[PDB]
Amino acid sequence: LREELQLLQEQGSYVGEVVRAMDKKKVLVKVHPEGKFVVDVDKNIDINDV
């Protein structure tokens, strides 16, 4: 809990919403209070599953 606290202490963790997926392995992610972003793999989760 101490170490995990340290990784979530600075920025915490956000809540993403995928508006669209791209073939470049980069997935468009939109945050509600914020604008639209896009972020690359993410190898633990398969692209076809997104």
Place this chain on the structure above:
Amino acid sequence: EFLHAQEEVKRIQSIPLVIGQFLEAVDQNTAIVGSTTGSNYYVRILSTIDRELLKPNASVALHKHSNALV
């Protein structure tokens, strides 16, 4: 030393705290909760109580920086 560890988990984060709006418990040890600022956050839940007082819809106190479920 385990009883002394309980004080290690109660030390964090102590005071002060920020109010947050709980959404739903996605899985064990972590759930998504809304900040009073309006930003929904993916948060690790404190280890002691994960269940009885969680409730689908309840106000919950979080840390300033981490926004951790306490």
Place this chain on the structure above:
Amino acid sequence: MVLESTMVCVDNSEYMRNGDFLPTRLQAQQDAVNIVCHSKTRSNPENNVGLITLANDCEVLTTLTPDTGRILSKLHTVQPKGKITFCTGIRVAHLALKHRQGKNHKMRIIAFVGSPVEDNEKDLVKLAKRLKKEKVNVDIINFGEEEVNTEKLTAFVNTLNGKDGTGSHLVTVPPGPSLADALISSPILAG
């Protein structure tokens, strides 16, 4: 300047309420306290002087301090009624002199005895030999009435110190009317 800490003892015994000293022994010895406190002020600024009451149960009204305001404040409404106590009147001064900050300051005591004392000769000889080991020098000035041509106190001062020690001087007042400020003239010129 010479370093020392003086401790004055005002006489509140029930024999000091009479007006044999002009106008009264209360104001006579009060003016004596004024002249000695200003004398220590003109001597050294570092020397501090408290007061102690000998009669009844001895109590320190003012702890050792360089300012005389508190001393002059306690001289008033002192209610001088009680029995004189001597054997503990030197030891109280020594007791406040063991708590002193400065170790360079020598231990010095002045006291005014205006009433007869019941202290036996053996008690005073024990305190004489004790003050030799403690090196404490006490300068006494006898006031009021006592055994005619006071003896026990005189021999007490002589046997308290020796070689020289130049020393402790006991000035006995002669039985005659005079102003107090004129009685303190001889002790303030030379010990």
Place this chain on the structure above:
Amino acid sequence: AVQKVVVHPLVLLSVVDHFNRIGKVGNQKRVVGVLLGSWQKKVLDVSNSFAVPFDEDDKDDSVWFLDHDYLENMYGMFKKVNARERIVGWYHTGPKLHKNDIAINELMKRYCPNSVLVIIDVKPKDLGLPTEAYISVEEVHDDGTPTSKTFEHVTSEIGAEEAEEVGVEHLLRDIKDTTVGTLSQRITNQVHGLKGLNSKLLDIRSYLEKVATGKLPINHQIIYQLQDVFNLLPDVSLQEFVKAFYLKTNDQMVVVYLASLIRSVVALHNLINNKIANRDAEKKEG
């Protein structure tokens, strides 16, 4: 008047460490200082304190003298840094007070209307909860003798607020805490009989001793009255105490039944879930 007092470990330590101050320089007597209390209700509370140089001559065995100017300056500093703190009385490390301590209170009674003196013990030995608390009152007497001032006992307890509990509990690193429900009540159960016995046994040896030596008074008056009060209770059946038997057991009736009620439930969840998680998890591995 005053009911009970609360003395923090911080101020208590502040007496002990000063005992280390005068310990190396010695020599005789005991540490004497002025206590700083905090009064929020009829219950009394102590937070900090300050030591004062004190020496008792022996000739003169009843001669006692304190520093008044130093008292003024130090109490003025503590009033400067803390407005809530004030002098509630004085303290000494004893271990046993002397007859001369009656006037010591009378001196500082000009500072505080009622000054409570607190004995403490720097070397823990016996017989239980430490320190002591005395209040200065005058009960006169039925004899019509001149008013005698005798200090009366005030119950003392060790406590703290928040931050003062931190360091105290942190520095021990010795015994389990607490632990409530298992080893908190049983250990104190033996403490009840042990601390009851030794208190009673030392004092009851005192009672037999008081009539042989220590007379006068001693006995009378306070002794015989409480004696008969001690003879007020035998104290058992006959009669109704016989009837408390089966209702005490009957209070145990439902408790044993509830015991056995949940004992089977513990064995239920444990054995069921474990035996499944044992054989059914091992069969997939091999």
Place this chain on the structure above:
Amino acid sequence: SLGLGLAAMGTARQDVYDLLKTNLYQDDAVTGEAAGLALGLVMLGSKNAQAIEDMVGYAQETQHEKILRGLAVGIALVMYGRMEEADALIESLCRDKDPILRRSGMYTVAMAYCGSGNNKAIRRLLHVAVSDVNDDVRRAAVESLGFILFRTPEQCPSVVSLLSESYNPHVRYGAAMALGICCAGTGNKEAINLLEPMTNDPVNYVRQGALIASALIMIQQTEITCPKVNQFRQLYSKVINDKHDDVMAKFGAILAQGILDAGGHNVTISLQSRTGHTHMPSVVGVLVFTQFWFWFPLSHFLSLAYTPTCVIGLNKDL
């Protein structure tokens, strides 16, 4: 005084004990370890009476911790192979509330029982390895296991396997050291297996401990002995060439490369001669080498532990 005491170690000289007491009264802590270790070196195996009396009598009033540690290994080192003759002092060492003196009883009981499988020592040894508040004494407590049990290296991996999993890295460090010093004369693979996850712990210094321990298991043993030799040799250089790693952990990396390469690979360390008796310069050197942080010149005492392994066919004379 370290040169005088190491040169006269085991000689039981007299004049060295003279200037060592005035050096003990210099009151300086930086020379405290000098007087303390020298005093044990020259008196090694002599179980002197006034030596311990003066040392343990000087532990009280001194205000320094390095004089207390130097006297720790001092009174440890005078008492060698004395078996139960030293228990009378050991009782008083661990009963006392001084953290360093309880740390001294461990080294003392270590050298006095070296080569003995006496189980009477492991009762207090193990009990103090757990119930004690201080972490350094808990590390130095389990380091004694490899000193006494060096003759039977097969027991250490078994029994200490579970202590190597302890929650604090201090006991994990002592636990890696036990397998390091005890199994160094053997090619046991179980010890290596338990020292694999130790370098993976997120704690810094425990990884260092795994480096040196794994360096003692591989002395004179090439890749054909155990398959993890090259596995480890790439790790030693990897940790020292990465800037992100701690300087602490990368100290013991190059140090471990020095262990494997000691003497140009030609020499190794042996605590047990084939004759059946323990080699005291080896044991003494390594046991002082246990804590290299506290004094960096103490890392040179490991040179005495290096013994030549060679076949000498000298017929006679020159």
Place this chain on the structure above:
Amino acid sequence: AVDTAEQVYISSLALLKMLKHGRAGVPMEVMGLMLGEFVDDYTVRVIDVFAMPQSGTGVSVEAVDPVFQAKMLDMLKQTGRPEMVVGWYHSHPGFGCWLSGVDINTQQSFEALSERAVAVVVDPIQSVKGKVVIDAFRLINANMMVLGHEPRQTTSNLGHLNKPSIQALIHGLNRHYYSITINYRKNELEQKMLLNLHKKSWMEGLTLQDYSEHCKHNESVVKEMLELAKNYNKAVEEEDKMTPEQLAIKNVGKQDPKRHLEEHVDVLMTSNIVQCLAAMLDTVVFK
């Protein structure tokens, strides 16, 4: 010229005054002064801690009153121990105890009078109780930036001190500052009594008083408190008797929880407290 690992020896009396002076100042940062003795460069000890009076301007380099120091030092000279002051400490209640531009301004003032002058920060907030808490700092010389800044010797305590790192603000002090280790010393006699004082606090004075008052409690309203336990045992158990059936519906222990689950442990522990305090009756009331 010589830089080595350092160590702070604290007194049982010291910490207690630290956290107290710091608690009374919350939120506002206070100014304390550390008192002790310099034994050498690689070790230091604090044998005493005294509190400074607050000021309306706050923490500043001018907040130390020279006339107040000479007075207080008078009171400490006549005390058995007239030891020279060593350094200063200040509380940091609401954050992670980082040295600010006001702290550095008084660091260079203490480094000219005192060679070391260890900087100490104490806060009650960041720790419930059992933490060692506090902190300690030291000012490295800024004019040395051309030469090697990277000691020490005996790096053990250095490694344990710089850890955990532990966020960012903490790391922002690695430059221009370095911490210094803290370890308690005993003083185990007074510590032994200090344990028994708080523990005996829960115990009674005569010890037969509050236990017999719990015997007066042993039948109150305890038959009614046992009716409280009886309602918890009916109400929690008839809904915990559907759980063995529900385990067959979900198959088997997937999340969950409900709850409404367990809680009988606390009921059994309170009932056991009831039966033991009640078993004291036959011991006490009888003889």
Place this chain on the structure above:
Amino acid sequence: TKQYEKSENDLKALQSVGQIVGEVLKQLTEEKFIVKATNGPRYVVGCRRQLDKSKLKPGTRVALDMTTLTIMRYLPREVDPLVYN
């Protein structure tokens, strides 16, 4: 000449930064007070020893610390447009 030094000494007191205004929602315990800044965020925090719990009361405008986020001084009320009215 000396009045200027009086002003400059006032600057030394101006080295103390302000605080953030906030309204008292409720108090969970004596160590827990629920306060809400005018900006919208809520905070459960403590209080110092100068204030009284009875004098605070919910729905009271108070000033919170910049870091601890705790009450130091309070004000009864304020309103900026009315003065014009």
